[PDB]
Symmetry: D2
Subunit: 239 residues, 4 copies
């Protein structure tokens, strides 16, 4: 393939859908997660087993580089969360969420940029949330909310610094999507009902619907689109 892409958290949910959409655009994709084998074989992608909660990010980027023969696109879709209120949350749990979502985002982008710069073209796509703009409503997720909001600042900062290198950096903010990760929410009506009532479209999204936009932000369509957050939430935030 032509453009080379690395997608973390690419074996499940949104990450997997993004990897699939990229393969569809003719990109050579590498999927990174703890168990990427099955997904990689199904999607026709390169598997890169890794534990991003502990393994050195720079090491994953180097493996992606040598496995793909280059690096043009980076999508950090890895997921993890500790749904506990601030007063019940430990510092270790706090740092776990912030580390994977923000620290790793920084480390991966920092390691990838020089290769995108070398190619003269790059796309960095961070994954946000409706919590990039709100606090999650009935769900107690202060750490996740803080991390996903922090990504907007990182997005603007890196976009500003790397624009002249041919790199565009944006934040895709998915709304409420049907994935294994959000399954415990679609669970009890106590949470699903109030949330869904605020979604104009009246339904949660399918991972593939979110991926359509991700592909755009990883393509030539985003040539002049950088340092921005793009919310794909069925109208939730506008409600």
């Amino acid at each position: 393939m032509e453009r080379k892409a690395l997608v973390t958290g690419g074996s499940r949910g949104i990450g997997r859908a993004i990897a699939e959409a990229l393969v569809a655009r003719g990109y050579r994709v590498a999927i990174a997660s703890r168990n990427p084998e099955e997904a990689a074989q199904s999607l026709g992608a390169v598997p890169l087993p890794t534990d991003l909660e502990k393994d050195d990010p720079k090491g994953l980027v180097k493996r992606a580089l040598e496995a793909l023969g280059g690096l043009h696109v980076l999508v950090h879709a890895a997921a993890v969360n500790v749904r506990k209120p601030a007063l019940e949350l430990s510092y270790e749990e706090w740092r776990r969420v912030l580390y994977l979502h923000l620290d790793v985002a920084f480390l991966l982008a920092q390691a990838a940029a020089p290769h995108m710069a070398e190619a003269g073209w790059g796309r960095v796509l961070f994954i946000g949330s409706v919590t990039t703009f709100t606090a999650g409503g009935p769900v107690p997720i202060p750490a996740y909310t803080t991390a996903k909001t922090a990504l907007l600042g990182l997005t603007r900062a890196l976009a500003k610094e790397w624009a002249r290198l041919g790199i565009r950096v944006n934040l895709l903010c998915p709304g409420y999507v049907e994935t294994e990760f959000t399954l415990p929410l679609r669970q009890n009506p106590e949470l699903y009902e109030p949330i869904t009532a605020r979604i104009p479209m009246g339904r949660w999204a399918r991972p593939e619907e979110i991926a359509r936009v991700a592909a755009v932000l990883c393509g030539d369509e985003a040539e002049y689109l950088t340092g921005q957050a793009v919310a794909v939430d069925g109208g939730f935030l506008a409600y």
Copy 2:
């Protein structure tokens, strides 16, 4: 063609580029402006001569409907401006800007929605600006700034109301684009220099680069994207 689209201000600048991109997607497009003939013939679109600053908007939508055999997409890219500071601006000049940019946006969307609802699928694309989020900097454009910001509220409101009808409504916010309309700005360095210094990419956009994103917001890619503003500004706002 399959999907039917009406693009106002479609004979020049951004509007023309959007019409061209839509034709490229295989849409049957109608171009509306005072003198749409040449552009329509060049792009392979249907011409609909109109003076949106005076002609009844509902009349233009009906003509588009009967000319295309349906109506699925509406892009209000008409342009006009009175670059005068608030204390030097007359009420007539104020209303002229607000009328074309906001009042006509409302009237066109209101008239189009029932036809999109009839089709069970629709896309409304309003055109914003960096002034949807700022005041224009060195340029005195209070009326334009107010109008383009007001469009964000209209966008959210219509998106909420029409989501269940199959209609998605968004606001495309172009940054500084090279068009005849902005020519008097790229004019003296007094204005061009300060502005460009704040654009990370270091250059103004080409109309076609803005149109790439417009096409997305007028397509299946936006199935779950509604009630949002999308800034394509080369990083200006993130700076």
Copy 3:
């Protein structure tokens, strides 16, 4: 008194509370509305009977000037609304809402600025809403939403232009407040319940609580605060 203030819609709800808070700060206040007599006598303010939906705004400002012996502060708290969805709303109803909320805001500020500039100090306070940032949720108010959002653009534009004249311009965005105007909402639980569930503080505001912040934005506390919106909503938007 020292500082002179004009407050439209100052005989009821939020407007009245703001007028009362200003009188408390020792300002000489003028209250404008169709029937300001009783409120003016109760608050110790100057009454200026007017129908801002039809009377020339410049005329009201001139009357305020001559009635107070100057003009330093302007608060446009007049209210009016047509709670109808876009497809059921007439253009006349649309313009009625936009005229009073936005057109009059512009006209009043434009007429007041020269007097504030003459004094070398001024405060313009526009009144927003949670709909300056959202679409009102279960309530169908597209015109109001558009108007209150448009005020953010006007706020930024005038703030930029008049900053060097000693004028600060901001937008106070009240959340859900208990007033006669919102009474029909606190009415049926169908609307009150869903909304209140999204307010962290679990209750609607009292007009006086909103006025505390209004006073600040009309005082020396705002010396370096201009071109901003300040939401006082009990946490609704952050939810």
Copy 4:
């Protein structure tokens, strides 16, 4: 005094000005920093020497509690920065900035809340920046930008969770203020000129002007104001 307040970074710049304004409101204030002695004696505050970049935050809050006889207000104004672009920044430097600005913000608030809840009234004031909304322009501060933006998410999250406990949580976003910390910026015109050109008021703020608003957000004026960011920037963001 009645209300008890802890202000970190309270011996210099904005932090010191906030402490002074609070003492002026009749609050019993404790100032925390590495060398708070001189400032505490000058302001009439309680000194709490600490190195927040290494000392346990919970320990500082406990010392404040026992030193003041309670805890109602928390202002985290400590400052630190590594002005290096992303590609030149080390992970240790990144974590240093994020630790003091965000991690410590979380830890201090988490430790303080139970005491505010015990009192049935509390005010948490985090310190943002124009970089809570932009990337700093000509200044390379990706870590600081990310941290100050992340604080907006934390602000919303804690505000939502603690609202019913009588605690209000907000983010004060100062613009460009004259302090020792920003001295190296007001230094060369290369940076000062471009920035100042974007400030409508045409000048940088004095610490005391920022403190006026801080006091408000730490007082009864904020009774119904929570989960919000308030920018006091002389119009910079609105430009």
